[PDB]
Amino acid sequence: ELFSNQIIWFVEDTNVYRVTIHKTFEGNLTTKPINGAIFIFNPRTGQLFLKIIHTSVWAGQKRLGQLAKWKTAEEVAALIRSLPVEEQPKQIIVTRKGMLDPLEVHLLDFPNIVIKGSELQLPFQACLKVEKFGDLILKATEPQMVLFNLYDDWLKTISSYTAFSRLILILRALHVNNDRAKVILKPDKTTITEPHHIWPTLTDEEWIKVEVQLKDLILAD
Ligand SMILES: [Cl-]
Ligand SMILES: [Cl-]
């Protein structure tokens, strides 16, 4: 299913429409949008397309929470249209059911694309908690798309299946307990993340220990 000769994308829209809320000195609530992002992820290759959503897009309308699902689908279709046919996904998987109808309507010109929902817990949006992504999104002054490889150099020595499993444990651990996940991921004073990598450089033994610890963190909360 997931890693065969078939391009698959996971699409995550949770962090597209984001706001900060503040109680003013007068006792009222101000709600100000902040920049968001769509995560579009290929589990076989590790490719992430990060579409930064700048707050200027929101200016007109109410129910921005609903509108964001539509905006997400619009941007997925725009990405597909910008790619040669051979690079277009065969399947698009969303773990948020709210994305199903908007995607169906936006992708009517792509009859080969299958859209399905998922009950999986795949918090790709947790990438915001990694400083590289967080600052990038925060500081953007306009929409843009940025490419990343979320598996770093792992595929040189492990399968796509193994790499995906490691990534999901990392994201889920960051989602549930950010502070503790970051400690687990830095087992030594000398632990570094290369400038061009997302995740730390760890030995195989260190990864084994990390993977068990992240799993236990996820079970604990
Ligand atoms: Cl939803
Ligand atoms: Cl989770």
Curated annotation (Swiss-Prot):
Query: Consequence of mutating residue 19 to D?
Result: Strongly reduced interaction with RNA
| Region annotated RNase H homology domain, chain positions | 1-221
Top-rank taxon, per record: Eukaryota
Q: What is known of its domains?
A: The MPN (JAB/Mov34) domain mediates interaction with TSSC4 and SNRNP200. Has structural similarity with deubiquitinating enzymes, but lacks the residues that would bind the catalytic metal ion.
Q: Which disease is it linked to?
A: Retinitis pigmentosa 13: A retinal dystrophy belonging to the group of pigmentary retinopathies. Retinitis pigmentosa is characterized by retinal pigment deposits visible on fundus examination and primary loss of rod photoreceptor cells followed by secondary loss of cone photoreceptors. Patients typically have night vision blindness and loss of midperipheral visual field. As their condition progresses, they lose their far peripheral visual field and eventually central vision as well.
Q: What is the tissue specificity? A: Widely expressed.
Function in brief = Plays a role in pre-mRNA splicing as core component of precatalytic, catalytic and postcatalytic spliceosomal complexes, both of the predominant U2-type spliceosome and the minor U12-type spliceosome. Functions as a scaffold that mediates the ordered assembly of spliceosomal proteins and snRNAs. Required for the assembly of the U4/U6-U5 tri-snRNP complex, a building block of the spliceosome. Functions as a scaffold that positions spliceosomal U2, U5 and U6 snRNAs at splice sites on pre-mRNA substrates, so that splicing can occur. Interacts with both the 5' and the 3' splice site.
The name of this protein is Pre-mRNA-processing-splicing factor 8
Q: Where in the cell is it found?
A: Nucleus; Nucleus speckle
* Involved in interaction with pre-mRNA 5' splice site: region residues: 1-221
Q: Subunit arrangement?
A: Part of the U5 snRNP complex. Component of the U4/U6-U5 tri-snRNP complex composed of the U4, U6 and U5 snRNAs and at least PRPF3, PRPF4, PRPF6, PRPF8, PRPF31, SNRNP200, TXNL4A, SNRNP40, DDX23, CD2BP2, PPIH, SNU13, EFTUD2, SART1 and USP39. Component of the U5.U4atac/U6atac snRNP complexes in U12-dependent spliceosomes. Within the minor spliceosome, which acts on U12-type introns, interacts with PPIL2 and RBM48. Core component of U2-type precatalytic, catalytic and postcatalytic spliceosomal complexes. Found in a mRNA splicing-dependent exon junction complex (EJC) with SRRM1.
